[PDB]
Amino acid sequence: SKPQPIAAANWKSGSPDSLSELIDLFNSTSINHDVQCVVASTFVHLAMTKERLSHPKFVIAAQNAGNADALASLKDFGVNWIVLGHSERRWYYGETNEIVADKVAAAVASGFMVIACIGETLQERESGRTAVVVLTQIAAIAKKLKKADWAKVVIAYEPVWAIGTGKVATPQQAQEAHALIRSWVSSKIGADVAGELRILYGGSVNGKNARTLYQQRDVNGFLVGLKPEFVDIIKATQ
Amino acid sequence: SKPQPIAAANWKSGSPDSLSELIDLFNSTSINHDVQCVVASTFVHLAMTKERLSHPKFVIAAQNAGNADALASLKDFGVNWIVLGHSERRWYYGETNEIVADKVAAAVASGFMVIACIGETLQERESGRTAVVVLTQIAAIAKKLKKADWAKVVIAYEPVWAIGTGKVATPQQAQEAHALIRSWVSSKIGADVAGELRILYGGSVNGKNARTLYQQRDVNGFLVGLKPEFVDIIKATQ
Amino acid sequence: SKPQPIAAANWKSGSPDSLSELIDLFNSTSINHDVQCVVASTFVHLAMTKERLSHPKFVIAAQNAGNADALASLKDFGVNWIVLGHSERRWYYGETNEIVADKVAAAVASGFMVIACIGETLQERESGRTAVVVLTQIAAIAKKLKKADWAKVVIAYEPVWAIGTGKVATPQQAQEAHALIRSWVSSKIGADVAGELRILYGGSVNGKNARTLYQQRDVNGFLVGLKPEFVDIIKATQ
């Protein structure tokens, strides 16, 4: 019943050696279930990742593409995945709902698989606005898409409200949010689309609480930071 | 006598683990005098610093806010300090005196404590224009502020004449610059504001010059790189 | 005969300490032959490298430019060399042949020594367009220069087609690229300019491969990653 899960991890910082070491680890990870793993890299590290990463269940993603030429350069380089709408961009780089929506449509048009992030802030959640905020964010994206395009879309629910707090969302809070999103998709886009849609939990987690989160009916994977424990996150989607 | 000193450290680069370990160091550091410690982060590291850093004498600062939305996201995230007009902004990104002044005024308006950086090049210094250059930079900032706003302002002198050319300024050179800045603030803004103003030294600081630098009449602390030796930089402000 | 070679290294990422240890290594290295060594980094690392680098055959470069208008201020900060037109900028940051040309000319007029990167993609090489692409890129640069400016210019042939493939161009492949560039410079700019022009091999290479590459008639050095093995790259220009 659940579609194919996705485990996706973002580079933050550190030496080329620290990255090549992770790549070696992932190349040597035997994964027995069907899962798409995604290593989202910064531009400066795409060359080394393309050079060293080779695993049948791993693809490379970009974290950003600031112009049409960048998208085209990524595709020419064999990078077919991209992460869009992450809170860092929305918070600090002026990326409104509409800007994010336009980027998703552009990337889809270019033939990217897109992991599109949505999520409400602390202030938004506490004023009881989780539903309106998150559904407004996905509505904006859907505005610029056709029904067929959804096969190229993955949604990450980023519990922006929990960033920096040291607390993972309970499986109940995560399920509620993922459920909220799927219901909107089912009703506004299509029951077929909703069933096939991957909705990833984009809060940080360890392997233990990731397993429990994955037991939730509307959780289809994770978007986390790149580190050795990403192997545990992959296994959590079994 | 001197106002409360400030010891402020800037993240440069390295892995999330490296930052984590530094946070562990600072959390366990005993500080027995009145000093405001500041850790200036890049966006990507703000989440871990908020999550892990907890010392009564430490606050978190941003290094940039490129737009109005970014200032607001920072404030909502509980980031109440910002460093503006630092050498990268002025000499790589070309922020003019006016752009810096506008940023300082906007941040103050939004409730931030601002560390505003000023400093002259070797061409400026060697051609006898240290005073006109440095004081013109601060004059641009002052134009956009009211007298009451100075309680939310901190000045940092970055001797880019030395930094950019491989020199280490002496305590005498640091003092002369700080004294120039203080006399300007005294003259233009008020002797009250001048006596209360923190002017931090932002040149090359090591374990042997830190105390002599702090003991200069017009130095009120430091703007330096984040390193384990920051503990000793803090100690030098006692 | 061959002009003075250049050995240039780009710092990728990682902690200040890791870079500082490399600077220590470089400082203790005898380099007996006539060669200009270049260490290029992002802006944040300039302070440390300026402070600590002592080797008399090394200079410090900025890893790229921001806007062409901000090159003058970066010169005044104290940077004397710059790398422009690197594939990363052309691919991801919208730097067309003409934007690269404008930056090169602006850097020269501000008194920089410039390493200007040119090279064709895998798609361009496969389609038989190595010469047209590379010569179009260098033609654009030349259009904004005068003959006297070439004394301040260095070309890096970046084998962009090989990026991410883990393979180095063969000496035959590198020589062919460098020779067609020089041939164009000789005819279009001047024989003497072409004789004095340094054309660097701008792909990562190790000591042994570098030594064989440097044997080629039109190879005048290297633009590579900043790592311990950079000492062997320098030695390979003997």
Question: How would you describe this structure to a colleague?
Answer:
Three copies of one chain form a homotrimer. Chain A has 238 residues and is α/β, with parallel strands linked by helices. Chain A has one domain: TIM Barrel (Alpha-Beta Barrel), CATH 3.20.20. Helices cover 45% and strands 16% of the residues of chain A. The first copy, chain A, has eleven helices and eight strands. The first copy, chain A, has helices spanning 16-27, 43-52, 68-76, 87-92, 97-109, 122-126, 130-143, 171-188, 191-196, 207-214, 230-235; strands at residues 6-10, 36-41, 58-62, 81-84, 113-118, 153-157, 199-201, 221-225. An eight-stranded parallel sheet of chain A has the order 7-6-5-4-3-2-1-8. In chain A, strand 2 (36-41), helix 2 and strand 3 form a beta-alpha-beta unit. The interface between B and C is medium-sized, with 25 and 26 residues. Chains A, B, C: Its EC number is 5.3.1.1.
